[PDB]
Amino acid sequence: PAPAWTTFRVGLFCGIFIVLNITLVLAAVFKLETDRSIWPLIRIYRGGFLLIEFLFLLGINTYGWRQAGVNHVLIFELNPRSNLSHQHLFEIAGFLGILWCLSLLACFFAPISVIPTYVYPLALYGFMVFFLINPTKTFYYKSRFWLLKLLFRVFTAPFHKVGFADFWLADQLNSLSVILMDLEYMICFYSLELKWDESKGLLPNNSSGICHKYTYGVRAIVQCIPAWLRFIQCLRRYRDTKRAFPHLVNAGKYSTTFFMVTFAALYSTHKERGHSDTMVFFYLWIVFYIISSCYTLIWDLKMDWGLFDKNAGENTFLREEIVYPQKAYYYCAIIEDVILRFAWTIQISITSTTLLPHSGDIIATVFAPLEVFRRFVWNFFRLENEHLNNCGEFRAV
Amino acid sequence: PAPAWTTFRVGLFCGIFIVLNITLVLAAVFKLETDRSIWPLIRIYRGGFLLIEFLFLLGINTYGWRQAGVNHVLIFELNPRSNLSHQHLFEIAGFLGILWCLSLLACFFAPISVIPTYVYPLALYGFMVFFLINPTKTFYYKSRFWLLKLLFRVFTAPFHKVGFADFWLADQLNSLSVILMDLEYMICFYSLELKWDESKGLLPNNSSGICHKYTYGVRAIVQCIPAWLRFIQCLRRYRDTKRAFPHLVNAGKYSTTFFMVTFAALYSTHKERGHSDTMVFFYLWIVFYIISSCYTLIWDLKMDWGLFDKNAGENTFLREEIVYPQKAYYYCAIIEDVILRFAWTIQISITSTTLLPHSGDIIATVFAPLEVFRRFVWNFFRLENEHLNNCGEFRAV
Ligand SMILES: CCCCCCCCCCCCCCCCCC(=O)OC[C@H](COP(=O)(O)OCCN)OC(=O)CCCCCCCCCCCCC
Numbered sequence: 001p002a003p004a005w006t007t008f009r010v011g012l013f014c015g016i017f018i019v020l021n022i023t024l025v026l027a028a029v030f031k032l033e034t035d036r037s038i039w040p041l042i043r044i045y046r047g048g049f050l051l052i053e054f055l056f057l058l059g060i061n062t063y064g065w066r067q068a069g070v071n072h073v074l075i076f077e078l079n080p081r082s083n084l085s086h087q088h089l090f091e092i093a094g095f096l097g098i099l100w101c102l103s104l105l106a107c108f109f110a111p112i113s114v115i116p117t118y119v120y121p122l123a124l125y126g127f128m129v130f131f132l133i134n135p136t137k138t139f140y141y142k143s144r145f146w147l148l149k150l151l152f153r154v155f156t157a158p159f160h161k162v163g164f165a166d167f168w169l170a171d172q173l174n175s176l177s178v179i180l181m182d183l184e185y186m187i188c189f190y191s192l193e194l195k196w197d198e199s200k201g202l203l204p205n206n207s208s209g210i211c212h213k214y215t216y217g218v219r220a221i222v223q224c225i226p227a228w229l230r231f232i233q234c235l236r237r238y239r240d241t242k243r244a245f246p247h248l249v250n251a252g253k254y255s256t257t258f259f260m261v262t263f264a265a266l267y268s269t270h271k272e273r274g275h276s277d278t279m280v281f282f283y284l285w286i287v288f289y290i291i292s293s294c295y296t297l298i299w300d301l302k303m304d305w306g307l308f309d310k311n312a313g314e315n316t317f318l319r320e321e322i323v324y325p326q327k328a329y330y331y332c333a334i335i336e337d338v339i340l341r342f343a344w345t346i347q348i349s350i351t352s353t354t355l356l357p358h359s360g361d362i363i364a365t366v367f368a369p370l371e372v373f374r375r376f377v378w379n380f381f382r383l384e385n386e387h388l389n390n391c392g393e394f395r396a397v
Numbered sequence: 398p399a400p401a402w403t404t405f406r407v408g409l410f411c412g413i414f415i416v417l418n419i420t421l422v423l424a425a426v427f428k429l430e431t432d433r434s435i436w437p438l439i440r441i442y443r444g445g446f447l448l449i450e451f452l453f454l455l456g457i458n459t460y461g462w463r464q465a466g467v468n469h470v471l472i473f474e475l476n477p478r479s480n481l482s483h484q485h486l487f488e489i490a491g492f493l494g495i496l497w498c499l500s501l502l503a504c505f506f507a508p509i510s511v512i513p514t515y516v517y518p519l520a521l522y523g524f525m526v527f528f529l530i531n532p533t534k535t536f537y538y539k540s541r542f543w544l545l546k547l548l549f550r551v552f553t554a555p556f557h558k559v560g561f562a563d564f565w566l567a568d569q570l571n572s573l574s575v576i577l578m579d580l581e582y583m584i585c586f587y588s589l590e591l592k593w594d595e596s597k598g599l600l601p602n603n604s605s606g607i608c609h610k611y612t613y614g615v616r617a618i619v620q621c622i623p624a625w626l627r628f629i630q631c632l633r634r635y636r637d638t639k640r641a642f643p644h645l646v647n648a649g650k651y652s653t654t655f656f657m658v659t660f661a662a663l664y665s666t667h668k669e670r671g672h673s674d675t676m677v678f679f680y681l682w683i684v685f686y687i688i689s690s691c692y693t694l695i696w697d698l699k700m701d702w703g704l705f706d707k708n709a710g711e712n713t714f715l716r717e718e719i720v721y722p723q724k725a726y727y728y729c730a731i732i733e734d735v736i737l738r739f740a741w742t743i744q745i746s747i748t749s750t751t752l753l754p755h756s757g758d759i760i761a762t763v764f765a766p767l768e769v770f771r772r773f774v775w776n777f778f779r780l781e782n783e784h785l786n787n788c789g790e791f792r793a794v
């Protein structure tokens with residue numbers, strides 16, 4: 001257990017965060033002009049929010065692995081004597097949340113001299129970078145170095161051998177692609193959409209512009225960076241092991257992401273010019289996003305977790321040896337993993353008709369956190385099945 | 398050590414309290430009308446503030462006794478297996494501070510329907526009562542019962558035998574008499590000064606009234622309730638032990654409080670009628686408040702702590718066996734205890750000439766909080782000397 005002050009700091013930051021969030025809500029309800037546009041701020045802060053909300057759930061994941069004898073430290077190939085318990089993750093998440101809440105509160109009131117308001121969204125992320133690559137031996141220097149080595153080995157060519165940490169982080173990126181998109185948005189917005197002379201330009205000067213729409217495919221390209229990484233890693237694992245089934249079908253699972261993304265982007269772009277087969281590119285997209293979903297869903301239950309097993313009839317469609325205490329848990333997860341993997345059926349269908357303007361954005365940002373929550377649920381069973389089945393073949397018996 | 402969640406709650410409440418205090422400061426600077434009077438609110442909330450600030454320091458006192466082998470549990474005659482560590486006191490103080498900050502913030506903004514603003518100052522204290530006498534077995538039921546038994550044995554006649562807990566609490570009340578006065582103020586103000594029909598009467602309807610001045614001696618009487626208790630307890634100890642010196646001189650030390658209080662009150666009251674010898678009742682008061690101070694100061698060093706000892710020349714005017722690690726500490730305390738026991742020399746002298754209106758109140762409430770700090774310093778050495786000298790004769794060898 002963390003000796004005496006890590007728990008105290010966890011509580012301190014958790015206590016500051018709640019009241020800062022309530023102050024944020026109240027200031028948003030009351031002291032907003034409701035005259036100029038408001039969407040750029042949401043699109044810029046959505047990334048930081050669902051990153052802090054990713055760390056806060058990874059903490060609970062660590063706790064859940066520890067309290068069930070999973071032995072995750074041996075799986076990840078981590079140093080046995082030194083490793084981060086859940087309290088350190090809670091504390092880092094709380095500190096980043098305090099910084100994020102402060103930087104967002106500083107744009108609503110904007111209590112400051114002539115210096116503009118568009119500095120806080122930048123500076124915040126600057127800190128989030130200058131805290132990660134800090135060369136000094138302070139603020140978890142033993143952790144960020146391993147994190148950066150892993151992130152470099154993942155974000156690169158298949159030149160490196162694939163281990164469980166590489167695959168795990170590359171897959172976590174796959175269900176986290178809103179930060180990448182919602183960082184390219186900030187870059188492209190500060191590039192050619194913000195007039196620096198206006199000291200309030202962070203909120204646009206009217207109640208649109210070419211910043212978000214799929215125009216030159218840059219957004220469509222960045223939509224699947226992680227899919228590319230996982231595809232290439234599966235190809236490399238096959239090249240090095242020559243067993244076709246698992247890794248080839250895995251790469252097939254990710255190719256559907258390429259297909260769905262390109263079809264959706266092409267349909268959305270041809271809608272503008274009013275081309276002929278806008279009914280076709282709308283249909284075919286829906287086809288791929290269907291099969292892709294199925295191609296993923298089965299793989300989450302058959303190969304990832306391994307629940308629908310032939311034997312273990314007493315456990316009623318579970319494994320023969322389960323770890324977590326209460327069986328009912330699994331069942332709910334299944335239902336949840338069936339719902340939240342679909343995800344995109346309700347929001348395209350909510351947008352059947354033009355109910356209101358900025359129809360797309362509001363559903364898009366209410367589903368991102370549920371997407372990152374599905375990944376928080378996925379780990380509990382991926383790591384568990386890895387513990388007592390070696391379904392990945394990383395470990396050599 | 399508190400197992401896992403008491404430290405977390407200490408941190409949670411400490412984290413909420415800081416930001417609530419900053420919000421209080423900002424709302425006081427910005428959203429106050431600066432048109433009607435503001436003093437009743439300060440006089441009503443001063444008591445809760447310097448009570449929470451008393452508990453928060455008693456926590457550190459407990460920690461300091463524990464970290465020096467004082468064995469305070471045997472001194473107070475407490476149950477050895479069950480007793481409150483410093484974390485529980487920190488947590489109670491933090492919870493009360495959150496409640497107080499919320500109740501004060503609810504009067505500045507007053508965000509509410511037609512219900513008036515003068516309810517929050519009442520309800521707060523109501524809770525502080527309905528949390529202390531709670532008959533259920535919840536929220537430290539083992540502590541408040543002993544506290545109430547002790548408070549009943551102290552607040553009564555000399556019919557009860559005097560033990561160390563009785564003397565200690567009765568003496569702590571002596572340097573805490575601002576809560577009593579600043580509760581009688583609330584009572585006398587809600588009695589005949591607040592027009593209930595006005596839904597903003599908590600702040601008076603103008604930019605005075607007979608509520609604070611010494612008029613019928615009620616304030617002057619309540620000024621020394623604790624002095625009466627300590628005087629009577631010393632008399633009882635003498636009656637039961639027949640040793641004249643310590644307890645008789647002790648009672649002499651408290652009689653000077655009666656004298657100083659009555660002289661000050663009589664002078665302040667005769668100033669109004671413009672009687673003849675207003676120069677005399679101003680002089681004589683100053684005399685008593687002088688000797689009283691000395692009568693206390695020596696007793697804080699000679700008999701209470703026991704520093705100016707004949708032997709122990711190497712320790713340079715300290716005891717022969719000291720407990721606390723660093724000697725220098727003692728010296729500062731002495732100087733501090735020489736300054737803060739005087740206290741009333743700067744404040745009357747700051748009021749030589751009419752520098753500004755509400756001159757008396759501002760110094761009165763800026764020194765209330767240091768007076769309670771002098772008592773936080775006094776304990777560190779009173780209990781220590783009790784440990785290895787038995788200077789009180791409670792313990793029977
Ligand atoms: C505009 C938006 C852009 C924002 C840019 C900022 C980028 C990141 C912001 C802050 C970075 C987060 C802080 C770094 C997290 C450290 C967590 C950590 O150390 O996890 C490792 C942990 C065990 O590793 P140990 O530290 O014990 O290793 C000691 C033995 N070698 O092992 C674990 O239990 C696994 C946990 C790994 C956590 C992975 C966190 C990665 C999140 C970033 C990826 C997505 C960003 C695009």
Ligand SMILES: CCCCCCCCCCCCCCCCCC(=O)OC[C@H](COP(=O)(O)OCCN)OC(=O)CCCCCCCCCCCCC
Pocket residue numbers: 444445448455459475476479480481489522525526529539540541543544573576577579580
């Ligand atoms: C308008 C203003 C009016 C406000 C009215 C409200 C009045 C009080 C408000 C809240 C009361 C505070 C909560 C009660 C404090 C409990 C502290 C406590 O329990 O201290 C006792 C502690 C050891 O006792 P144990 O609980 O371990 O006993 C178990 C073994 N029998 O022993 C210790 O270490 C000594 C600590 C004793 C603390 C004394 C606190 C008393 C403060 C109140 C006196 C002044 C009020 C006028």
Ligand SMILES: CC(C)CCC[C@@H](C)[C@H]1CC[C@H]2[C@@H]3CC=C4C[C@@H](O)CC[C@]4(C)[C@H]3CC[C@]12C
Pocket residue numbers: 064067068324325329332333336377380
């Ligand atoms: C229905 C939707 C909202 C969610 C349903 C599934 C969620 C709530 C369930 C599924 C998996 C569950 C986790 C499964 C395993 C553990 C470890 C156990 O030792 C403590 C509970 C804990 C930490 C559970 C927390 C709640 C949990 C996440």
Ligand SMILES: CC(C)CCC[C@@H](C)[C@H]1CC[C@H]2[C@@H]3CC=C4C[C@@H](O)CC[C@]4(C)[C@H]3CC[C@]12C
Pocket residue numbers: 461464465721722726729730733774777
């Ligand atoms: C000069 C004024 C403001 C104050 C000077 C005296 C104060 C600061 C000194 C006097 C007595 C000191 C305490 C004496 C004993 C202890 C216990 C020790 O194990 C830790 C430090 C601690 C807890 C000290 C805290 C600081 C202290 C209160």
